[PDB]
């Protein structure tokens, strides 16, 4: 599955930082 | 900000990483 656009709002942004920015 | 680019508009993982 291609890395397609997703809405990331509120605390999902935190989750995304944790999954995508942090080791 | 990330909310305008990824919550008001959706964003890919690769776009989100721009904000790390």
UniProtKB/Swiss-Prot annotation, chain A:
It comes from the Eukaryota. The modification 4-carboxyglutamate is found at residue 12. The modification 4-hydroxyproline is found at residue 5. This is Con-Ins G1 B chain.
Swiss-Prot record, chain B:
The modification 4-hydroxyproline is found at residue 10. It comes from the Eukaryota. Coiled coil: none annotated. The modification 4-carboxyglutamate is found at residues 4, 15. Disulfide bonds join 6-11. The modification Cysteine amide is found at residue 20. This is Con-Ins G1a A chain. It comes from Conus geographus. The lineage of its organism: Eukaryota, Metazoa, Spiralia, Lophotrochozoa, Mollusca. The chain holds residues 95 to 114 of 115 of the full protein.
């Amino acid at each position: 599955t291609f890395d397609t656009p997703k809405h990331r709002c509120g605390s999902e942004i935190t989750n995304s930082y944790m999954d995508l920015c942090y080791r | 900000g990330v909310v305008e680019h990824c919550c008001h508009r959706p964003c890919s993982n690769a776009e989100f990483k721009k904000y790390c």
